[PDB]
């Protein structure tokens, strides 16, 4: 349990000072379970966060234990202590940043009981204030998930018609796939170049807005048929746009390279779609396995900010307030 | 001569240095420079020694007493069946068939002599079964060459027309390129691909069919404004399909890849043409330099599709002179 996610940190950073992280657990257990803050530690240790950030196992002690933050930021320090105070000073909303996601994320995860106020209204509140600071932090991982959960509570029949309309067409489509994967893997393979070709994974909020703007009677056969490529360098994911098009037409006018061109600070993806293999618009999402660790799991945002409707926290308050 | 050597030499590190020696020799005691002018310009290319050997005494036996009994003991019957099967080969109205070519585009590059009626002649052989023949090899700068050349003096007010309506939006036509040039090298500069970007090579021949076709009236700002990428590696020549494609808007048809599907022999190279840099479409033919060499001076076709071998395909070759 401790080995796993204190293993899950080692492999980023050959790093010092070991020793308080096995006292910031151990202080923690001893201050249904204790396992919430470690679980999030592991999550934050999955996104890669610094060893301070895991130690800070001990946010939840201060309102829960008799213990105070003076007695804590003596033992560890003074940057463990703004950052145990920041994230309790976040509230409900008609470092501390990406702390607070995490601990959502998982209680979001886990919904054990299903109590009344808290069950519909966090929902209502994630999509609200969390979906779209998760996605300021640029991991889409993190904010895709918490979506599709509060989705599921807020509108359960809606999300049942989703699905139970995926699961329909879902043999034909699945097959259509599978000759793409084929298709585009063997000229690759020809060609030279190391590269993966997943199937994207999909989301049923967004399914539902896609659906909402274009209104009933959409084409669903389609608009569930996503691929992405995946690359070494830079260069191979330009590589990839030559195969692409080789065996099928592209459009007009749906074409973007964001390795060119940076929007919202560094995105670092090429988006096409091509006529496909039965006349399917098809949307192919080139971009390497450094931009795909940027892309999902891991960012610091730095600049690009714009308000809708540590500096970043006095940032955030504004955003809510 | 010394310079001869060693465009040849660094091809190929090769032994028996002597029998091209004793070629250029024998051929001098035998106006000398057209087989040796010839010699250089197969060895550009980069055939057999034995070959460039031949070349050098192939022409001895029509102006020289000597015979090919006596010059085929002196070198073996290799030099003797190239020699012999190279002057077969006449005029209409594999090592021996690019031999020919050679001799035939050089004749055509220099006219001094205007008065023969090869003048005209000539020039309508080489169109008719020469160019064709050069093109099925894989040769295409010999037959765009060749080409040019005939042409021009087959029809001298025609290639002037062309010539001058090619020099008159030269300066606005060559602009745009140099700013497609700029915005291409940067990107891929950027995104770290080592690539040259060389404007393509016009030929008049081309735009004179090509306007036929399409008749007078045709936009000549945008008919030539063709780009040359060239790569390394198979990998970088997809990678410059991605980097045009993120400048400019690429159009459905008119896309291929023949790295992928090489029609008859291996003629690998990537062709796409993309609109609105300036509102007119562009030829992009991306290739490596290996596939550009193979190209560019292909040394042979294993068949035309339409020794032994070259007597038949000469037979064939030979009526389509006669047409
Ligand atoms: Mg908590
Ligand atoms: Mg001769």
Redesign the interface.
Known sequence: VLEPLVAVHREIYPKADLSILQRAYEVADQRPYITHPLAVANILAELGMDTTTLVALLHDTVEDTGYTLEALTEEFGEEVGHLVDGVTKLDRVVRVLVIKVADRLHNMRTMRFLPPEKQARKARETLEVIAPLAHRLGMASVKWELEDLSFAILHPKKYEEIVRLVAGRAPSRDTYLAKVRAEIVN?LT????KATVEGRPKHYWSIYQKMIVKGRDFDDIHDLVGVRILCD???????????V??LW?????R?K?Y??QPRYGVYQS?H?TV?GPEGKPLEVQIRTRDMHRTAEYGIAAHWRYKEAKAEIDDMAWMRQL
């Open positions: 000229t020809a060609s030279k170049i360098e830079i260069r191979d994911c330009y590589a990839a746009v030559g195969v098009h080789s037409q592209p459009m007009a006018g074409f390279d390795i060119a090429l096409t006529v």
